[PDB]
Ligand binder design. Structure first.
Ligand SMILES: Nc1ncnc2c1ncn2[C@@H]1O[C@H](COP(=O)(O)OP(=O)(O)OP(=O)(O)OP(=O)(O)OP(=O)(O)OC[C@H]2O[C@@H](n3cnc4c(N)ncnc43)[C@H](O)[C@@H]2O)[C@@H](O)[C@H]1O
Ligand SMILES: [Mg+2]
Ligand SMILES: [Zn+2]
Length: 215
């Protein structure tokens, strides 16, 4: 099961990834998580990635493609993987097509979670994230059981630094620009599937899981 999740910032990629992982346990490969970890530990690639992230810009394609190519070469990706947030440019999609050729592999689906851009700033500025397990919640749209507390592991919820209004405006503009050409690229391959991201979280997943049924 070789999958890509795509979607504009705040459409609900991470939320659906956790469900897909919870049910199928395929590795979750998130370029955002990889960069964020690189930052936590002060590698030079991490420190250079931070300046783009802080501004809501994309990290350059060469860097991103390099780390994905190395990550997909591991034994845990031999039977399946869930790419989350990569590709997000056509150039990344071309790279991925060729990385996969090198490995003797092919994508099964690119799952695009669609939500109108005009709803998305609200989704990110109100997001709260578990410090321990990374599960996400939203103060209005999807709150936790107890204010301040993750329902999964009990950890404390924080605001991600790039979920600032100004950074969010730039992330939506940057990703909007990249999205239509990427959609066209995969629509031509035949394995792009669009999911209505406006529905409730379980129903979105239901729609995704209809596709994943043939493992
Ligand atoms: N490939 C690449 N190339 C170059 N640079 C790269 C890169 N990948 C990453 N980067 C760099 O790293 C940065 C961060 O990238 P990354 O971490 O990938 O962020 P992103 O793509 O902006 O996605 P987000 O995590 O913001 O949103 P999400 O859709 O996953 O939302 P969630 O499920 O939490 O949901 C959002 C909110 O909505 C809520 N919610 C979700 N679903 C629903 C629903 N159905 N109903 C109600 N509320 C919902 C949630 O509770 C939550 O509060 C980039 O800006 C860039 O700088
Ligand atoms: Mg995410
Ligand atoms: Zn948690």
């Amino acid at each position: 099961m070789n999958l890509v999740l795509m979607g504009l910032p705040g459409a609900g990629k991470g939320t659906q990834a956790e469900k897909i992982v919870e049910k199928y346990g395929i590795p979750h490969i998130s370029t955002g998580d990889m960069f964020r970890a690189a930052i936590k530990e002060g590698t030079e690639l991490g420190l250079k990635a931070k300046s783009f992230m802080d501004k809501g810009e994309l990290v350059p394609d060469e860097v991103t493609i390099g780390i994905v190519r190395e990550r997909l070469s591991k034994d845990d990706c031999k039977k399946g993987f869930l790419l989350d947030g990569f590709p997000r440019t056509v150039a990344q999609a071309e790279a991925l097509d060729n990385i996969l050729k090198e490995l003797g592999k092919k994508l099964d689906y690119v799952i695009n979670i669609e939500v109108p851009k005009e709803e998305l700033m609200e989704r990110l500025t109100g997001r709260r994230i578990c410090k321990t397990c990374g599960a996400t919640y939203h103060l209005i749209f999807n709150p936790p059981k107890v204010e301040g507390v993750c329902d999964k592991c009990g950890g404390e919820l924080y605001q991600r630094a790039d979920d600032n209004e100004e950074t969010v405006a730039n992330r939506l503009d940057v990703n909007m620009k990249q999205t239509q050409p990427l959609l066209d690229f995969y629509e031509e391959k035949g394995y792009l599937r669009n999911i209505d991201g406006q529905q409730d979280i379980n129903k979105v997943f239901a729609d995704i899981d209809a596709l994943l049924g043939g493992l």
